[PDB]
Amino acid sequence: MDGVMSAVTVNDDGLVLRLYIQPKASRDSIVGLHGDEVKVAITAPPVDGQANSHLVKFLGKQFRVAKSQVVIEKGELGRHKQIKIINPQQIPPEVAALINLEHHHHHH
């Protein structure tokens, strides 16, 4: 069972998220953000100067967050990159999957 570190990881007051950027795209093309590793592509290199712009913007509306919560961890020098989402707000229906967890005591 050599697999305990999933793409998504919860934390004290946030969660980690793996990534995989790919140059030459013109727009944050969401290949298939489905755990394991979220691939993406942009015409902007990993240059924290311009790369951080689109990166935050995209994941900003998607997760309804921003720099005030989005923080680049490492791996920024390539596709394999991690980001810690501090105290989010919402998420895409995709993640809404692992969110059932029936509540205690069934309501009439």
UniProtKB/Swiss-Prot annotation:
Pfam families assigned to the protein according to its UniProt record, in alphabetical order: DUF167 (PF02594)
Gene3D superfamilies xref list: YggU-like
Highest taxon of the lineage: Bacteria
Coiled coil: none
One Gene Ontology term, aspect cellular component: cytoplasm
SUPFAM superfamilies: YggU-like
Record-linked HAMAP family: UPF0235
Family (UniProt): Belongs to the UPF0235 family.
Database matches in PANTHER family: UPF0235 PROTEIN C15ORF40
Protein name: UPF0235 protein YggU
Organism: Escherichia coli O157:H7
Organismal lineage: Bacteria, Pseudomonadati, Pseudomonadota, Gammaproteobacteria, Enterobacterales
Gene name, Swiss-Prot/TrEMBL: yggU
